[PDB]
Every structure is written in structure tokens, then in C-alpha cells.
Amino acid sequence: MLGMSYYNQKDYQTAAQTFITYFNTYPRGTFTELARFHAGKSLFLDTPEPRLDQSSTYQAIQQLQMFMEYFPNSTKKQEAQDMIFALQDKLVLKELYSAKLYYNLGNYLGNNYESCVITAQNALKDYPYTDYREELSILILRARHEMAIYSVEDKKMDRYRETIDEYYAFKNEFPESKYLKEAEKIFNESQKV
Template sequence: MFFKPMRLPLFIILCLTILLSSCSQYQRVLRKDDMGKKYTFADSLYKKGKYKKALKLMEQIVPAYRGKPQGEKLMFIYANTYYNLEDYYLSGYQFERFTQAYPQSDSAEVASFKAAKSFYQLSPRYSLDQKDTDKGLEKLQEFINKYPNSDKRMEANTLVAELREKLEKKDYEVAMQYLKLDDGLKAAIDAFDNFITDHPGSKYRKDAFYGRFLAAYKLAINSVPSLVQERLITAKGYYNSFIKYYKDTDLGPEATEIYQDIESRIVAPETEPTI
């Protein structure tokens, strides 16, 4: 029994031919020293969204084109290739290099924004070290200050708000962790104090006022007898600060209950007998 050789449809054959031809052409350009061909081919691949292949060519030719007329475009798409590949460390670095090398470029504003957004993308979840978050905030604010009328300003402000809330949550959670520790109550009071000062518009502000009051109360009732009265009075002061702003909130009744316990524990000072 004989089997006839299977014939591939003409369309598939053409596609395979084009693909193999394209791959061999890419390899030839990659291996040769013709900078002009590398530039043209890299630009073509970039426009087609073939960023990994384009990047290999760009890495070979970027040094040769610095300071030349084609260098401005090449440096921008080089940075943007890293951005599209989600390599935000290198995209941030390369976009910053672009803005320094071509401050008058028509692409300088976009490059500045994408540099800042690259650092925003590097910001980790709130529970981790926030060094990159701080840098992202710094770069976004620099962009807003430099381009106050940019059409990217609204997005930049949104990103700033997101990063600030992440820092707020980080600081608040640190204070709350101290509050849960018997030997961390002093640190909790300090942490809540710093939070209230550093984040005046935070959505966690009410909880920070209450947390400071609760920490002071716990510290007072668990102190050695000689310090109890002094610390109860301090806790009472924190209660007054809380109810000044948040008396009618969901935490108000609980705070008042604790306050009543404080009042029952405070010993009235003895008065001198009159003669």
C-alpha cells in the first residue's frame, strides 16, 4: 500500500518561506557591521512590535549614533523598547538619559513622563521596602512641576495619590504592629504621632488618632504603680484630641467607654487641710 506525500497548502508554504527568509535576514544583519542596515532593520522591527529582536540590534548601534542626527530617535525608541518589554529599571534609566541628552526634543515631555512612570511601576506592595516608591513619587512630582500644563498631568497626579496611599498604609500598619505588642506601646504612640504629622489628609487619620489613644491607655494601666496616674492623664489628653475631630464616628462610643474607665482610675489629688 502506497501513501501519497501530503501536500501543504500554498498559503502555508508561502508563510514558512517568508518566515525563514525574515529570520535569515535578521541573522545576517545582526552579524554584519553595517550600522545603517542595523538601524533601518531595528526601526522596522520596533514598528512591528518585535521588541526583543529590535533590542538586540539597538544594543549594538546605540553607542555609534550618540551625537548624530539619528541618535535622538534611536535613543527614544531604545528607552521605549525597554518600557514595552516591562524592564522598568532600564527604561527609567534610559528615558532619563534621553531627557538629559535632548532637553529640547519634542519627545522630552513624553520621555520625562515615562521615566517617572517606570519608577512608579517599580514600587512594590506596601509591606516591602518603599525605597522605589519614594523615588517614584520624587520623579512624578518633578514631572508635574516641570510640565504643569501637560495632558499627562492628571494621570501623574493619580499615580502620585496611589504611591502616597501606599506609604500611608505602610506607616499605619507599622504603628498597628507596635500596638499589638505589650512592649511596643511606647513605640506605637510615637509611630501614630509621626503618622498624624506626616499624613494630614490620610484616610487612616481617624484610626491613627484612636490608635494613639488606645496605646496610651494600655501603657498606663500596665505600668508600675508610680507611673500609672501620670500616664492616665496623658491618655486622657489623647482622648480629647480624638473627640475633637472624631466624636461622632464609629469609634466614638468605644473611645468614650475607655475614657470612662480612665476617669474611674484617676485619683483626685489630696487637698491641703484649711486652718
């Protein structure tokens, strides 16, 4: 048995590989849920900053999901539950930065404002219950109005009504929110048309 020594020295790679190789070669090795869950947190703790490669975070998600079904009896099911939530929020934060980048560049070569709305909508659909739903929704609203401004004169009223639909959808989703003031100026500009 070695993994816990590598875990105490914060060498998460060796700790992880000495734990997992032992409970892969035999379903519990001889350390059972302790090795599994130490390996899960060790794999979690190598997590990059939210805009690097992310390769270990998908692996962490699937490893914890498969832990929940190898040992559903464990008290560490909760300790994996909130961990997979934290990982999901980081994965969503990556997509949120992507959508923010497309809003920042804007109507530069290409379009990039239609890109912003579809990127953040993909975020909303791929991870339904994240914290960042408010930020994603307000980013949709801002990008909707931004596209409505610069569109061709035959095709502006439809973008305006899409913007007002997003306004009422944001109110339906969040009857109160810290971002309502800018939303309401967007509404007051678009409801005229």
C-alpha cells in the same frame, strides 16, 4: 526611540531607563511630556508591597515633583498629583504596620507601647493629610490606655488624662467615626480616674 516598546511589554526597568536617559541628556529629548510621564508611571509600577524596601517610591515621589515644575503646563500634572498621593499613602502604611507591630508585642521585654504612640505620632506629623489618619489616631488612643494600665503607681493619673485628652481630640477631629464604641469604653474606664 525605544521606551514605549519596553513599556508595552511591561518591562518597566528598561522602559524607565531608556526614557529618562533621553530627557536627561537633553531637556525633552524628542518626545517631551510623553517620555517624562511614561517614565513616571513606569517608575511607579515597580512599586513593592507596602512592607519591603520602598527604595523606588521615594525616587518616584521626587521624580514626579520635579516633573510638575519642568512641565507645569501639562494635563499630566493631575495624573502625577494623584500618583504622589497614592505613594504617600503607601509610605504611611509602612509606618502604620510598624506601629501595629509595637502594639502587638506590647509589654514584652522593653516597653513597646510608648514606642507605638510615638511611631504613629511621627506618621501623623510627617504626612499630614493621608487617608490613614483615623487608624493612626485610634491606635494612639488604644496605646495610651494600654500604657496607662501598666504604668507604675506613682505615674498613672497623668497617663489617664493623656488618654482622655486623646479621646476628646479624636472626637474633635472626627465627630463621627466607625471606631467610636471601643473609644467610648476606653473613656468609661479612664474617666473614673
